[PDB]
Every structure is written in structure tokens, then in C-alpha cells.
């Protein structure tokens, strides 16, 4: 997709149609003649094109109007409306760019942002741009949150976000032109090595992967066609569905074995009946011959009855011998029909032990992608966001993903080592209570017009709470929080002084011995300038490994590698880092997932701002005061960096609309 249509696609918009959001701001247009709608769409797509063509500088209304041609550049109000609309919603002029129009010297409104991860940072830049007073309170001694990079000497390794999942339609594409991001393609070749250390032949690998995909396809059929979505009042999980599908395939293998052996008995039985006939017929023949022989003893000349006896017995004997030859013909047919079936047995098993282990590697891989065991994913909605995937190859940030948040932090007022303890929101404003993480007694009070909460879902779930809301959040919100899933996945960074692995291979797998341990160090990444190997811990293993010391974890890693590349080839690592996202009090997990019993609607609920009740009985309905952003608040792109970034852009626009007013909606 290129030209103005490419711009829409790159902004996640339909090029030939107005969105629901656009309808809300341009009700006059969407309800009017088709021609006007087409004019609007062109202005919108073109404005997006100008921004995308050069995201390093602020795209102003004046600049836009000048670059438009007749007759589009004639309706100046419509152009200005579209421009302000895009700007306000963060579709243009987001991230880090050179500002043309200086920031208003005197600011309007005060906003406190809890958390300085990508969602918080993106919202802050926007709010600052719109002219608001913004302060971010961050518990950690750094910015970035779940975007955390290990840096020591020349060693660089991401402990959090690491992959950019395609640039087609990804807002990170704009960010990568603004920030010194060194993107490198991830080669998809990934050999797997069984526990014994020997590689998996191409044939197996492909067959098992095809089956893995077939089984996923099968659970989808089980969900949409057999409506197997509730079992014993409980929502069915992906794991359960897969177990059922596999059991059914095992059943089919046995059903076929049975029908095969039943064809053998049926034939084997027909043979018995034929043989019985033959044995009885041979007796009759044996007897007739004896009679014929006796009749032939009456030598001629003999009366006609004696002659008749000889001739008669002869005929009866021949007739019976003909019957025997016919049955012998049938015997040869049945006998061979048996050597045929005996030689063509159906399959012995659905999946051998080896096949199951390799299959478990694929499941571990899926558990890693969703940062959760398959038994916790909603069968109905686990892949609710698949239709929104970006295009292009997956990439990694060669210089460490932290370069993004660090850059987004430029010029912002950030209070590090400040842990928010309480959020108070009332009809006339909010107050946030925070402590200094280095000496908890030291307390801070921040008064503001609005609060943007970007605390991770893991933190929001903490019981008893880590952050108290006063008044408490309503049940519609807390229930969404309880329902949503909050996963976990960990990484083990191994820094070596030499390269003992295949340098042309970006990643390789380790196939576990049992299903229980499938996610334990199942995948290794070779990705940076330095000789570094990154090991992954997924699924059920993630949670358990957190209770294991680094040395024992690293020991296991080395053991695996020695088994693959040879004992003498693998040296002791010079530096090792092990992440523990679940234990991290500021994260309490890695990222959200659609839990069984949940749905994409919960992400919408997480996103709805809270409006306090009036302070005075009978006083009019207040303004919303408490807003939410973060990866767990964006239905179409949850659990990602771009999702977090987009959530911040969204809330910044909503806050600004609420407190600064909208001049583009009229």
C-alpha cells in the first residue's frame, strides 16, 4: 500500500471509510453527501502522509494547507478541523520531533501520571504539547518500566520488551525514525535439539509443526462449530480444548486399529467356513471314489444297472471334484486378501513419546508468546487480536530497547524513586500520596486536576492492594481487573567471552523431557553485537523458576548448551542476569492475556475513566478525574510496546478534550 492509501494503512485506518471516532468528531460529514466524505478522507489521508513522510518535524496546520492542492486547499476550516483532530488524537505530531511552534509559556491544567513506562511517557509528551502541566511519578530508579535493558561494558540485552513485530502499521515505525533505533531482522530458522543434545531431523520438525497448527485449527472448530465453550459451569481454556482434540485423535487411531483387525477376523472367519466345506467335500469325494472303485470290481459283461452304477458314480465324482476346484479357487483369493491386510496395518500411535516432546516445544513456544500456560487462556478469545497484526519482518533492537523510553523522557518532569501509595479523586480535583522508595517515611502530596494511572495490571491485582484508591474503584472496574489474565515469562542473559554457537542462526530450541517442564529454557537467542545468548523461561516454568537461585538456573543453561555444542566448547559466562517479573513489585508479571472467563470487552472496561460523585448533595455531575492507560487497556494491541504507546496517546487526547476543550468537534 502506497501514496495516500499507504498513509491510512500505516496509521491503522481504513482509507476509503470514516471510523467511529471520526464520526463522533465529524457528525456533519459522516451524515452528509458521499462526495464530502471523500473530501474529508483525502484531507485526512494526505495530512497523515505529510507527517509520515517526515516524522522528525512538527506538522503544522499552515504547513499542511500549503502542501495541499486545489480544490482541497480551498476549505480551510475543514482542513484545520482535520488537522486538529489528528493532532489531538496523536495520529500526527507524536513522539519526539523538532517543535516549530513553541510551547505555550503559561500552562493550563495539572495532570499527575503514575508510572513512566511507554504508556505514561507517550501520554506526557502529548499533554505537554497540548499545553498542560505534567508530572510523572515513577517508583523505580529509571524510566521505561517493562522496557528494561541490561547494559554492562559492551553487553546489551533486553530483560523486557525485545521484539518489534513488523513495521507495517506499527507506530514504532515512526518512533524508530525519531530515535536512534538500530533495528535488525530476526532470521526465522530455528533448529531444535532434543534433551540428549542431538538435532531434530527436518522431516520430524515439519511434520510436528504441521500437526501443531492442525491442532490449533482443531480447537477453533471445537469452539465455533461444536460450541464447546463451557464445561461444568467453567469457561473452557485453550489447554483443555487441545487435550480433548489430542485425546480424540488417540481415540481415532484405536478406532482404525479395531476396524482393521475386525476385517481380518471377518475374512479369517469366511476362510473357516470355506475350509469346513472343503473338508466335508473331501470326505464325500473320498467316499465316492471308494464306491466307484467297488462298482468297477463288477467286471463285464455286466447288466445295465451295474454299468449304470459305474457311469453314475463317475459323474457324481467329477461334479464334486469340480465343486472342490471352485472352492480351492476361493481359498487362494481369501488367503491373499489376508496377506494384504496383514501387510497394510493402520497407524500404531497418534504421537510417539519423541513426537509429543517436540510438540510440547511448540506449546511452550505458544506459552511464551502469550506469557501464560495454555490452561489459562480463553478458548473463545485467546487470539481475539490476531486480525490486527502488523506486516513485515519481526525485528529486535540491536542497541537495546531502553533507547526509546530514555528518549521519550527528554524534557519531562519525572520523579524517580517515588512510589504512589494512594490516589484520592474528588469533584474538585485529585491528590496523590507517594513515598520515597529509599526511606518510606518520607511522604509527598501531589494535587492535580486529573490522574492518569498506568500501573500494570499485575499491580492493580495486588491483594491486599499496593495502591489504594479513595473512593474505592467501582465493581465494574475491579471485576474487570480480577477477570483479566496477567502472565509471566523470564529471560536468562548469558554473557560469554567467545562465540561457540552458530553465528548465522538467530535462535535455537531445547526440547524438554516432560510436558511439565516444556517451558524451561526451551529457547535460546543469539542477538547482539557482543557474544550473548538469551535463554527463555515460559509457561508453568516461569513461576517456578523464580524460586530458584541464579546459579542453579545458569547451571541448567550451561548443561543444555554443553549437551548441544560439546562439553569443552562452552566456557563459564563472564556475566549473567536472570529476570523475575512476577516478584518485581512494580510489575508483578510480564503482560496481560485473555484469560478463560474474560474477553476483549474487559480491555475496554480497563480503559474507562472514573468520575467521582459530587461533594455536595444535589450538585451537578462532575468531570472525569481518574484515567487509565497501559498495555492492559487497549483491546486491539494488548501486551505490547506499541499498545502501551497507543494507550497513552489515547488518554492524552481524552484528557485534553476534557480539560482544554475541543474546537474541531463543532
Amino acid at each position: 500500500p502506497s501514496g495516500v492509501e499507504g498513509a491510512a494503512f500505516q496509521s491503522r485506518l481504513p482509507h476509503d471509510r470514516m471510523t467511529s471516532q471520526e464520526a463522533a468528531c465529524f457528525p456533519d460529514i459522516i451524515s452528509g453527501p458521499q462526495q464530502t466524505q471523500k473530501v474529508f478522507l483525502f484531507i485526512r489521508n494526505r495530512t497523515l502522509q505529510l507527517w509520515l513522510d517526515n516524522p522528525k518535524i512538527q506538522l503544522t496546520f499552515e504547513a499542511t494547507l500549503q502542501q495541499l492542492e486545489a480544490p482541497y486547499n480551498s476549505d480551510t476550516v475543514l482542513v484545520h478541523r482535520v488537522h486538529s483532530y489528528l493532532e489531538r488524537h496523536g495520529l500526527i505530531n507524536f513522539g519526539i520531533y523538532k517543535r516549530i511552534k513553541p510551547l505555550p509559556t503559561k500552562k493550563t491544567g495539572k495532570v499527575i501520571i503514575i508510572g513512566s513506562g511507554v504508556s505514561g511517557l507517550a501520554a506526557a509528551r502529548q499533554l505537554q504539547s497540548f499545553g498542560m502541566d505534567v508530572t510523572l511519578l515513577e517508583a523505580r530508579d529509571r524510566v521505561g518500566g517493562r522496557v528494561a535493558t541490561f547494559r554492562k561494558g559492551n553487553y546489551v540485552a533486553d530483560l523486557g520488551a525485545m521484539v518489534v513485530t513488523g513495521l507495517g502499521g506499527n507506530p514504532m515505525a515512526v518512533v524508530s525514525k525519531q530515535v536512534n533505533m538500530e533495528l535488525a531482522k530476526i532470521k526465522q530458522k530455528c533448529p531444535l535439539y532434543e534433551a540428549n543434545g542431538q538435532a531434530v531431523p527436518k522431516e520430524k520438525d515439519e511434520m510436528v509443526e504441521q500437526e501443531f497448527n492442525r491442532l490449533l485449527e482443531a480447537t477453533s472448530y471445537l469452539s465455533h462449530q461444536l460450541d464447546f465453550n463451557v464445561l461444568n459451569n467453567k469457561p473452557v481454556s485453550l489447554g483443555q480444548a487441545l487435550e480433548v482434540v489430542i485425546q480424540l485423535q488417540e481415540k481415532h487411531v484405536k478406532d482404525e486399529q479395531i476396524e482393521h483387525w475386525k476385517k481380518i477376523v471377518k475374512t479369517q472367519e469366511e476362510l473357516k467356513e470355506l475350509l469346513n466345506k472343503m473338508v466335508n467335500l473331501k470326505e464325500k469325494i473320498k467316499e465316492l471314489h471308494q464306491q466307484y472303485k467297488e462298482a468297477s470290481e463288477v467286471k463285464p459283461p455286466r447288466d445295465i444297472t451295474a454299468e449304470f452304477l459305474v457311469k453314475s458314480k463317475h459323474r457324481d465324482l467329477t461334479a464334486l471334484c469340480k465343486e472342490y476346484d471352485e472352492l480351492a479357487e476361493t481359498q487362494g483369493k481369501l488367503e491373499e486378501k489376508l496377506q494384504e491386510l496383514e501387510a497394510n496395518p493402520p497407524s500404531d500411535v497418534y504421537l510417539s513419546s519423541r513426537d509429543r516432546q517436540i510438540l510440547d516445544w511448540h506449546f511452550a513456544n505458544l506459552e511464551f508468546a502469550n506469557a501464560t500456560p495454555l490452561s489459562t487462556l480463553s478458548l473463545k478469545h485467546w487470539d481475539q487480536d490476531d486480525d490486527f497484526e502488523f506486516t513485515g519482518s519481526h525485528l529486535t533492537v540491536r542497541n537495546g530497547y531502553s533507547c526509546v523510553p530514555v528518549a521519550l523522557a527528554e524534557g519531562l518532569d519525572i520523579k524517580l524513586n517515588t512510589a504512589v501509595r494512594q490516589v484520592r479523586y474528588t469533584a474538585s480535583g485529585c491528590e496523590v500520596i507517594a513515598v520515597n522508595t529509599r526511606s518510606t517515611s518520607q511522604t509527598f502530596i501531589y494535587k492535580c486536576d486529573a490522574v492518569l494511572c498506568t500501573l500494570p495490571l499485575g499491580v492493580l491485582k495486588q491483594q491486599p492492594p499496593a495502591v489504594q484508591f479513595v473512593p474505592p474503584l467501582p465493581e465494574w472496574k475491579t471485576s474487570a481487573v480480577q477477570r483479566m489474565g496477567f502472565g509471566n515469562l523470564n529471560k536468562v542473559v548469558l554473557c560469554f567471552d567467545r562465540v561457540f554457537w552458530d553465528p548465522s542462526v538467530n535462535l535455537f530450541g531445547h526440547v524438554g523431557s516432560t510436558t511439565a517442564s516444556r517451558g524451561e529454557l526451551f529457547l535460546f537467542w543469539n542477538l547482539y553485537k557482543a557474544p550473548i545468548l538469551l535463554a527463555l523461561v515460559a509457561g508453568e516454568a516461569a513461576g517456578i523458576m523464580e524460586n530458584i537461585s541464579d546459579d542453579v538456573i545458569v547451571g541448567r543453561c550451561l548443561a543444555i548448551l554443553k549437551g548441544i555444542f560439546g562439553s569443552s566448547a562452552v566456557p563459564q559466562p563472564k556475566e549473567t542476569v536472570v529476570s523475575r517479573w512476577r516478584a518485581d513489585p512494580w510489575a508483578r508479571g510480564s503482560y496481560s492475556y485473555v484469560a478463560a472467563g474474560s474477553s476483549g470487552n474487559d480491555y475496554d472496561l480497563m480503559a474507562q475513566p472514573i468520575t467521582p460523585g459530587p461533594s455536595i448533595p444535589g450538585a451537578p455531575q462532575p468531570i472525569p478525574r481518574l484515567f487509565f492507560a497501559g498495555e492492559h487497556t487497549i483491546r486491539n494491541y494488548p501486551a505490547t510496546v506499541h499498545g502501551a504507546l497507543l494507550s497513552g496517546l489515547r488518554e492524552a487526547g481524552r484528557i485534553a478534550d476534557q480539560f482544554l476543550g475541543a474546537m474541531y468537534t463543532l
Binding site: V244, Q247, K254, V265, L275, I304, T305, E307, R315, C321
Partner: protein, 133 residues
């Protein structure tokens, strides 16, 4: 609309495997048992067939008789008539058998004989006598 090719999933089977916590194990074991039950049934019949084959050892070779190859003749000799009459008594309307027994008279010639000698050889009485057995 359909499962992947080769994948089997019926409403009926899903219900069976998910009826309880160990429903699957039960289904699969009951099938493992049906399998053993059918296999021993095979060995059994195989053993029986092996014995029956051992009884047919030699086939029917020592009991075969050379063929009496003789051209078909037009005239009926007294010998032939008498053979026919007895043949009719034993076989009835099985003209093929009657022809075979006489040896030198085709099927049609035999059918004709039935009409031509009907009164003289009391063929009606003979046929009704074959019917009594």
C-alpha cells in the same frame, strides 16, 4: 465448517471424552481391551484354519478320474436308452447330468428323448418317482 483433513471430532465423541475427569482414560482403555480381545480371536481362528488346511494336505489328487472323451452320436442304442431311463430315475430333469452319464448324447438329444420316448419308457411315472425322494 469442517475439521482439518484427517482430524476427527464429533459432538458425540467430545461429550464422551469430557463427561468426567477420567472419561478419556476410560474410553481409551476400553478400546485397548477390545483390541486385545480381537487379536486373541484372530490367533484362535488362525490356529483352527491351520488344522483344517492340514487335513486337506494332498488335495483331491488321488481321487481324480481320467476323462471319458467320446464323440457325440445320433442313434440311440438299447444300452443308451436303459442308461437314460435310470439316469432320469436318479437325476430327474438335470439334463446335463443325464447327458454326462450316457456320455455320447448331448443335452438337446436328451431333452428330445424325453418327448420321443415319453409313453414307451413311462417317463411320467419315472419323473413322479424322482419327486418322491
Amino acid at each position: 465448517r469442517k475439521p482439518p483433513k484427517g482430524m476427527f471430532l464429533s459432538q458425540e465423541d467430545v461429550e464422551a471424552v469430557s463427561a468426567n475427569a477420567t472419561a478419556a482414560t476410560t474410553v481409551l482403555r476400553q478400546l485397548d481391551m477390545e483390541l486385545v480381545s480381537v487379536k486373541r480371536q484372530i490367533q484362535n481362528i488362525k490356529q483352527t484354519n491351520s488344522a483344517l488346511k492340514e487335513k486337506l494336505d494332498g488335495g483331491i489328487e488321488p481321487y481324480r478320474l481320467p476323462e471319458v472323451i467320446q464323440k457325440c452320436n445320433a442313434r440311440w442304442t438299447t444300452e443308451e436308452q436303459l442308461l437314460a431311463v435310470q439316469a432320469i430315475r436318479k437325476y430327474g430333469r438335470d439334463f446335463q447330468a443325464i447327458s454326462d452319464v450316457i456320455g455320447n448324447k448331448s443335452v438337446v438329444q436328451v431333452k428330445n428323448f424325453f418327448v420321443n420316448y415319453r409313453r414307451r419308457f413311462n417317463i411320467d411315472e419315472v419323473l413322479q418317482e424322482w419327486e418322491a425322494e
